[PDB]
Amino acid sequence: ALDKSIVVNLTSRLFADELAALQSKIGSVLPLGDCHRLQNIQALGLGCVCSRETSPDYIQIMQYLSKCTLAVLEEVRPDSLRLTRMDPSDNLQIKNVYAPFFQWDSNTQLAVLPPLFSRKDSTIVLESNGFDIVFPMVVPQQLGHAILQQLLVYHIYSKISALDLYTTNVSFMGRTYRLDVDNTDPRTALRVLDDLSMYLCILSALVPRGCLRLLTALVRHDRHPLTEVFEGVVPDEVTRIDLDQLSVPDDITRMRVMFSYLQSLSSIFNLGPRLHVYAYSAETLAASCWYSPR
Amino acid sequence: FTEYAGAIKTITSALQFGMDALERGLVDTVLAVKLRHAPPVFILKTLGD
Amino acid sequence: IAHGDGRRPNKQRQYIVMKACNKHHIGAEIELAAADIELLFAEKETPLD
Amino acid sequence: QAENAARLGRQVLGLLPPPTHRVSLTRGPEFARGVRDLLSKYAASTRPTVGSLHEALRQAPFRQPTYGDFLVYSQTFSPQEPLGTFLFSFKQEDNGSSMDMLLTPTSLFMLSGMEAAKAPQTHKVAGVWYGSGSGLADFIPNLSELMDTGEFHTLLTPVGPMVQSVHSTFVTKVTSAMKGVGLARDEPRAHVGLTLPCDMLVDLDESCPMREPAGLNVTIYASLVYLRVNQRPSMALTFFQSGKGFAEVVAMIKDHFTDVIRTKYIQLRHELYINRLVFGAVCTLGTVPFDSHPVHQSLNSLPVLVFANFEAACGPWTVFL
């Protein structure tokens, strides 16, 4: 069968300082450029798209991430980095040392994200060779989605300012977090938002009338736990659309096209490659998972 | 038989290639080790005195 | 050469070269006189013939 | 004549699925001796030979496609093809036992009815394989109405490249390939690659560079675009080739079809029909390995690409706009 291993040649002996950080994160996922055994250090970083002096754009970095082949480390020798590889469709041991710590279990789900909480904590610099290395973050899909939800909401409401507690905070059961935005290039994050303005005003044209009349019967008295968004008051717009008579075969043709455009929103809310964990050990922090590029 | 024996001549000559392109790897890297530790004359001549 | 830099190692390569033949043609002319061929087959019996 | 029959004793027993790894515990540690194909680093010598490495060449991966068997009217499937074309299976209703309808991309150009300059080369070639276009359109009387409501992408299932066509007078048998590289029938030890017309294919990774990552995977995508020409509904099918991930290519396909989106939707300031809103759909026709060079060919000319090591993996149609 197949071999997969990448040993990274390197032109200077590393110091004991940076050897201690790389020894601490010995099981870690990071992308790299080319699919070969021997490799320069300038491909191993995610820092070829996320630099210090250039303003990073986290969507473009994430857009960059689904192109690259991914890799897991095996050893850190004082000269050479030795890594193993991730290919479809192979079962592999994965071991999270990822610093904003979350808990996994057996039969969980994962996805790879750029560093979005602490760049200084997740990037170590190599002064010996001058090139810095950026580690990505692996997140379960629920917070994997909910960070990209808050990041798209941010770039809408930074443009309107042309304050922070509603825009830059990712919410979750038990914890709240801070997204890292000081210098972001919004332009690659806005062509995503330009295509959202395409889908969302088409979805406002084919709204079913029976589902709007269902809310005018619902939110006025029938209060439910998950309808507290409207706070007990109907919007002014929903009363204006339901003036027509309801007819069933009109909404049959509407709810098919409502169904088919919600197939398209997969393409604009995509994460990177996904990781299907089938067995996860708790006290050892390792796992087992098969890699699927989509 | 002449299809078999002409395909075993392919795979050896594809593998004599593999070893004899690695003996060039010695002669490359040994010469490249010397050039990393070879300062020029004009620097080293006055230091030699 | 197999080397330890990051660039792509080369696979095996071959060339097939086909040469051809140029052809050349030479001609020279020879005139034999009809008064000279006629006595080549004749019978001789006298010291002038 | 048993010498002829002992050949099948060799070749069938040599060509089987690898059996399940099951060793009784009373034998002891003999099962570890039966793990040979997982071992992946072989020793080299000063002068390695085939006799040294005939064990390393022996362990091979287990690869096999899953063929399809189609029985086609000989009016639709043109009797001469370049043996590697891509296929589709249009399906409306089971009327008989097994009579199947297959659509090559040159046949689906003729049912479309689009203008000549949209695909300037295959219009000449698809007009000599077929008539004016009504040799095929009599099977689908709903070509005017499937294009209005936009059901035509839901009725095609991408199948894969040809392997063999045994052609008779009234009925053509067609064996295609799903799930991977189909074994060539007439040439032994060979592999049928997928052949596309150069006119239909639209490359997507092309730069000055004016740097992008390499990988293991580049995926051929199909697309099918609902439009209107001469106030008549018609379709347009193109191909795409990029290894950029599905989140970029949907944004890269919309930039290609920017003009066609605008010239359609100038109409619906006047008439807003919700059936008309569906525009395109994108499938995934299977992967190509990275850095395989598509080899140009020409047939009668018709320039036709070909892809080595194409392995097929069909996907659904997702409606982009």
Side-chain angles (χ1 to χ4, degrees):
Chain A
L2 195 68
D3 188 76
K4 54 184 190 295
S5 69
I6 298 166
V7 51
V8 180
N9 197 1
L10 182 53
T11 187
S12 69
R13 186 176 296 275
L14 300 177
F15 293 162
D17 194 5
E18 56 194 0
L19 193 147
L22 289 170
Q23 187 60 253
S24 182
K25 292 182 181 178
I26 191 66
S28 178
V29 177
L30 56 87
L32 49 86
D34 290 328
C35 299
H36 293 282
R37 180 173 175 173
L38 279 73
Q39 190 66 253
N40 291 320
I41 196 169
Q42 294 178 355
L44 268 68
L46 190 143
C48 62
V49 73
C50 182
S51 296
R52 286 179 176 175
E53 64 186 2
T54 66
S55 296
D57 42 356
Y58 294 111
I59 296 298
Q60 179 68 43
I61 294 168
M62 184 176 173
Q63 188 177 0
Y64 177 82
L65 192 145
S66 65
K67 289 179 178 177
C68 293
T69 184
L70 277 72
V72 182
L73 281 80
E74 290 181 353
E75 290 181 352
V76 179
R77 289 183 180 177
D79 289 331
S80 67
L81 294 171
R82 183 175 179 178
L83 283 75
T84 189
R85 181 185 169 88
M86 298 175 72
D87 286 331
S89 172
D90 188 72
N91 287 313
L92 56 93
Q93 295 175 358
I94 184 168
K95 182 178 178 181
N96 46 358
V97 208
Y98 295 93
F101 182 75
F102 296 107
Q103 185 68 42
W104 301 346
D105 54 350
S106 65
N107 290 318
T108 187
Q109 184 71 40
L110 295 177
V112 183
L113 286 181
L116 285 163
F117 295 106
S118 296
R119 294 179 68 194
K120 187 178 181 179
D121 198 5
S122 179
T123 66
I124 60 169
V125 61
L126 276 76
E127 295 177 353
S128 177
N129 298 112
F131 182 76
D132 53 352
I133 294 171
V134 177
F135 293 160
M137 182 181 175
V138 300
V139 187
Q141 284 187 2
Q142 184 66 41
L143 286 169
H145 291 173
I147 293 166
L148 186 143
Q149 308 298 98
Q150 191 64 258
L151 194 147
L152 292 178
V153 170
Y154 178 74
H155 291 290
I156 299 169
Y157 285 94
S158 69
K159 186 69 183 298
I160 300 171
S161 66
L163 297 176
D164 292 330
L165 292 173
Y166 290 157
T167 57
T168 60
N169 285 322
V170 176
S171 67
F172 182 66
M173 296 296 107
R175 298 291 180 90
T176 58
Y177 292 104
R178 177 75 178 176
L179 291 176
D180 194 3
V181 174
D182 51 356
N183 290 318
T184 55
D185 193 3
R187 63 182 182 178
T188 62
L190 201 146
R191 187 178 289 173
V192 176
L193 293 172
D194 286 332
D195 294 332
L196 280 170
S197 65
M198 290 171 69
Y199 290 115
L200 192 61
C201 279
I202 296 172
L203 289 175
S204 69
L206 47 90
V207 176
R209 302 295 180 92
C211 191
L212 288 178
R213 190 180 294 275
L214 189 143
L215 286 185
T216 63
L218 192 146
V219 301
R220 294 178 68 90
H221 68 286
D222 282 322
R223 290 191 295 113
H224 295 91
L226 58 91
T227 185
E228 293 179 354
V229 179
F230 294 99
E231 295 291 328
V233 178
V234 291
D236 189 74
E237 191 186 12
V238 188
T239 61
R240 298 288 186 183
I241 309 297
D242 284 328
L243 56 89
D244 290 331
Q245 293 182 356
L246 297 182
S247 64
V248 179
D250 288 330
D251 287 330
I252 298 299
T253 64
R254 294 184 182 181
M255 288 295 285
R256 291 179 67 251
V257 187
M258 180 64 76
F259 180 80
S260 64
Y261 284 158
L262 269 65
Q263 298 185 357
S264 65
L265 293 176
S266 69
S267 69
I268 202 165
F269 288 110
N270 270 320
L271 299 185
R274 299 188 187 276
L275 287 173
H276 297 278
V277 174
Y278 62 92
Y280 174 77
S281 296
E283 64 184 2
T284 316
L285 293 175
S288 65
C289 170
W290 63 279
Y291 178 73
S292 66
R294 62 185 67 183
Chain B
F1 289 99
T2 188
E3 181 70 32
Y4 176 79
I8 200 167
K9 288 169 68 177
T10 296
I11 189 163
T12 55
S13 67
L15 187 144
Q16 297 291 322
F17 176 78
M19 294 298 290
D20 294 335
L22 186 142
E23 293 293 326
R24 310 295 186 94
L26 286 170
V27 182
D28 192 6
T29 55
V30 180
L31 178 57
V33 163
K34 297 292 184 180
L35 292 175
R36 290 180 183 176
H37 298 285
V41 171
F42 66 93
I43 290 173
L44 191 143
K45 181 183 179 293
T46 62
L47 271 63
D49 288 331
Chain C
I1 299 170
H3 51 273
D5 295 331
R7 63 258 183 93
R8 305 297 184 93
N10 287 317
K11 306 292 186 181
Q12 55 184 357
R13 294 188 298 271
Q14 290 183 2
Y15 289 86
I16 291 170
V17 181
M18 180 266 175
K19 295 290 183 69
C21 293
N22 294 320
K23 293 170 74 70
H24 297 285
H25 190 272
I26 300 170
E29 297 183 0
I30 282 93
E31 292 178 352
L32 295 178
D36 190 77
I37 304 169
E38 193 271 332
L39 71 104
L40 185 66
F41 296 105
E43 182 182 1
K44 73 281 190 187
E45 64 183 0
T46 185
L48 191 142
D49 286 334
Chain D
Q1 66 185 359
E3 298 291 327
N4 196 4
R7 291 181 186 272
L8 275 72
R10 299 289 191 271
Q11 293 177 357
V12 169
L13 275 72
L15 187 63
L16 287 174
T20 64
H21 192 193
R22 185 181 295 112
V23 172
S24 64
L25 189 145
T26 62
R27 186 177 291 171
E30 186 67 27
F31 63 95
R33 292 183 177 92
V35 183
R36 297 290 179 88
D37 52 355
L38 276 74
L39 193 146
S40 180
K41 290 183 180 180
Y42 296 99
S45 66
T46 301
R47 187 178 295 113
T49 320
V50 176
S52 66
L53 291 178
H54 68 277
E55 192 271 331
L57 296 163
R58 185 172 178 84
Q59 301 298 321
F62 180 74
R63 298 288 186 268
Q64 186 167 0
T66 61
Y67 293 148
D69 290 330
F70 292 151
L71 193 143
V72 192
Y73 292 96
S74 67
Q75 185 177 2
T76 67
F77 189 78
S78 66
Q80 299 178 351
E81 290 292 334
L83 191 59
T85 60
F86 190 75
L87 273 66
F88 292 102
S89 293
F90 184 75
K91 180 68 192 300
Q92 185 63 255
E93 184 176 0
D94 282 326
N95 196 5
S97 68
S98 177
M99 301 304 295
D100 198 1
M101 190 183 298
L102 270 59
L103 293 176
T104 58
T106 63
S107 301
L108 188 55
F109 184 81
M110 294 299 289
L111 275 75
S112 66
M114 70 185 81
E115 293 293 326
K118 301 294 186 290
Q121 184 64 44
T122 65
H123 190 201
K124 184 179 176 182
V125 177
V128 77
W129 296 117
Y130 298 100
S132 66
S134 65
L136 298 175
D138 53 359
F139 287 169
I140 307 100
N142 293 315
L143 283 176
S144 67
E145 293 181 353
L146 289 175
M147 291 303 299
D148 289 334
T149 61
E151 290 182 352
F152 188 79
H153 68 277
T154 63
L155 298 175
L156 293 176
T157 62
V159 176
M162 276 168 65
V163 171
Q164 189 180 6
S165 288
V166 177
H167 180 74
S168 299
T169 303
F170 294 98
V171 156
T172 303
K173 179 71 169 64
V174 171
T175 297
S176 59
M178 301 179 184
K179 273 177 63 181
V181 182
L183 185 69
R185 295 286 191 268
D186 296 332
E187 291 183 354
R189 303 291 183 268
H191 295 285
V192 174
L194 171 137
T195 71
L196 297 180
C198 299
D199 199 354
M200 294 295 173
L201 187 141
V202 175
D203 198 3
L204 197 60
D205 47 355
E206 183 66 31
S207 296
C208 291
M210 193 71 201
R211 183 179 176 181
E212 293 180 354
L216 189 63
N217 195 358
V218 55
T219 59
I220 291 176
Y221 291 153
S223 67
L224 191 144
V225 169
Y226 294 148
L227 57 89
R228 293 181 68 189
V229 63
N230 295 320
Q231 292 180 355
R232 295 177 68 187
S234 72
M235 71 190 75
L237 174 135
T238 57
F239 289 147
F240 292 103
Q241 180 186 3
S242 66
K244 292 183 177 68
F246 185 71
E248 307 190 8
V249 181
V250 181
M252 290 296 289
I253 284 173
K254 291 174 186 177
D255 291 335
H256 186 202
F257 294 108
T258 299
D259 296 331
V260 184
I261 290 168
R262 288 182 61 91
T263 60
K264 179 188 282 186
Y265 290 155
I266 285 174
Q267 299 302 112
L268 59 84
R269 182 63 182 88
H270 291 92
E271 68 274 18
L272 191 145
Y273 294 105
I274 302 168
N275 295 317
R276 298 292 190 273
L277 267 70
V278 53
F279 181 74
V282 170
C283 177
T284 303
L285 303 187
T287 67
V288 178
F290 184 75
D291 79 17
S292 67
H293 292 170
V295 175
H296 293 86
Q297 296 295 323
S298 293
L299 297 170
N300 52 359
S301 295
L302 180 63
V304 172
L305 292 172
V306 64
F307 293 97
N309 286 313
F310 181 79
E311 63 180 1
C314 178
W317 296 92
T318 59
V319 179
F320 73 101
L321 178 52

